[PDB]
């Protein structure tokens, strides 16, 4: 379970938030695949309700109808031909299981869903699973809301209804292999790993009991006996009833501090500066790295009112953005998760966004299809930072020194630093408002590395800027404050 199953080399995964099937078989085979990505992290894929207000919102794709692979982004023959394509370029698929609730209780009956499948959530009613009333917690929560009153009671955060939606009762084995047979059917199509959603609200115990229910991977892409991946997500950001080393033994867990402090760092607030970065990783009270997922955004956070709240760097901040990303995946804390957004209309009043809800690029409701540029960019509104040459080739960079370890770390004691991995790559960022100009000790063997920031190395040559090293290591880096890209990156493999 915490082992990633993705492609030997491979070292990371991107999240294609809501992205069409046919999208991702497509980028897989043109982009992914090539370019060294790990896997894919898919928005759910099983039936939802239509909110039509506000008009189809990013977040009604986590209140469940149903477990039929028909949702916005495809069907399940759509589906069912993305994972193969995927598993067939070496690009991994991990499905985000929405299984601690169903759809809010407040919702009417009927059809409006994405499937058509009936559904009176008032009365309790799902019969295209089929849930009854005594598939819920109703009777277990001890709220007399039914709702989540306080986070410091374990007991709610379970047993009640988060945010109104519909708690299942996992205790019950009916329950528990409903969702161990909707998990088994994914698995058996092809998927590597899930991502379990919301599990802060459901005890260690009852999803241990149903992971021990799965399969093990499709043989025709992986060897016999291997577990799926599981990341569960708990935001802890510590100082909290619920913890997230309760679900170490389940599989990984996402840790938010990361993104949270990380985001503080690179702003510099608080008082804080990138030289302390040094102890980075269990050093900051960080969970072991071996049962780590990191990430510097995800879908939820980026929004503005997340775990971490306005700290959190995101695509909208570009510039420091891509510097807290390639941090992130030049150190070997943690397993990586680089995001993947669509942009939308911002509309802040009194510091919060109003149109947080808006859902993906569409066509009256009808996902829109991800248009490649000639200059490897996007067109309708996907923003598609995994296709950034900066984050790119800091996803390559990982793979390249894989395994070597945090080695000649320096810093200015300001917000100047550099390190590197064993003697295949080398690091260095400015963050100082004022000029960089330093000769460093890399750790590379002499030679002239091309900065895969600026550039590519193409042939015998470099597109960006070119660092000689001699044969003792030793290299300067000359970096602007008002550089676009404030670091330079060198690995084993842009050396010319
Ligand atoms: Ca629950
Ligand atoms: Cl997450």
Redesign the pocket.
């Known amino acids: 379970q915490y082992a990633p199953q993705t492609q030997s080399g491979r070292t990371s995964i991107v999240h294609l938030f809501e992205w069409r099937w046919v999208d991702i078989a497509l980028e897989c085979e043109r982009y992914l695949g090539p370019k060294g990505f790990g896997g894919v992290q898919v928005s759910p894929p099983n039936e939802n309700v239509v909110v039509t207000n506000p008009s189809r919102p990013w977040w009604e794709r986590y209140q469940p109808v149903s477990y039929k692979l028909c949702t916005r982004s495809g069907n399940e023959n759509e589906f069912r031909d993305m994972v193969t394509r995927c598993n067939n370029v070496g690009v991994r698929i991990y499905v985000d299981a929405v299984i601690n609730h169903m759809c809010g209780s407040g919702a009417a009956a009927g059809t409006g869903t994405t499937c058509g499948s009936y559904c009176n959530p008032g009365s309790r009613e799902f019969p295209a699973v089929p849930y009854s009333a005594w598939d819920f917690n109703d009777g277990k929560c001890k709220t007399a809301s039914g709702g989540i009153e306080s986070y410091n009671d374990p007991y709610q955060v379970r047993d009640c209804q988060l945010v109104g939606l519909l708690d299942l009762a996992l205790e019950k084995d009916y329950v528990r292999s409903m969702i161990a047979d909707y998990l088994n059917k994914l698995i058996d199509i092809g998927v590597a790993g899930f ?1 379990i959603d919301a599990s802060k609200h459901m005890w260690p115990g009852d999803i241990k009991a149903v992971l021990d229910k799965l399969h093990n991977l499709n043989t025709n892409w992986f060897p016999a006996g291997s577990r799926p991946f599981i990341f569960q ?1 708990v935001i802890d950001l510590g100082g909290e009833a619920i913890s997230s080393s309760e679900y170490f033994g389940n599989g990984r867990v ?1 840790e938010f501090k990361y993104g949270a402090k990380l985001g503080t760092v690179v702003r510099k607030w608080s008082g804080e500066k990138m030289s302390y970065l040094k102890n980075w990783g269990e050093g900051w009270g960080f969970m072991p790295s071996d049962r780590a997922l990191v990430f510097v955004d ?1 879908h939820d956070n980026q929004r503005g009112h997340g775990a971490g709240g306005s700290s959190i760097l995101t695509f909208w901040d570009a510039r420091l953005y891509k510097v807290a990303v390639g941090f992130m995946l030049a150190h070997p804390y943690g397993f990586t998760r680089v995001m993947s957004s669509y942009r939308w209309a911002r509309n802040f009043v009194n510091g919060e966004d109003v149109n947080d809800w808006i859902g993906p690029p569409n066509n009256n409701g009808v996902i829109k299809e991800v248009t490649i540029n000639a200059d490897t960019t996007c067109g309708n509104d996907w923003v598609c930072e995994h296709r950034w040459r900066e984050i790119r080739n800091m996803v390559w960079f990982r793979n390249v020194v894989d395994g070597q370890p945090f080695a000649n770390w320096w810093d200015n004691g300001s917000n100047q630093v550099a390190f590197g991995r064993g003697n295949r790559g080398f690091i260095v960022f400015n963050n100082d408002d004022w000029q960089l100009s330093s000769t460093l000790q890399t750790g590379l063997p002499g030679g002239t590395y091309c900065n895969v920031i600026s550039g590519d190395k193409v042939g015998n040559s470099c597109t960006g800027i070119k660092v000689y090293v001699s044969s003792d290591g030793t290299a300067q880096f000359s970096i602007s404050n008002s550089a676009q890209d404030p670091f330079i990156a060198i690995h084993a493999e842009s050396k010319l």
């Open positions: 991502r997500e996402t995800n």
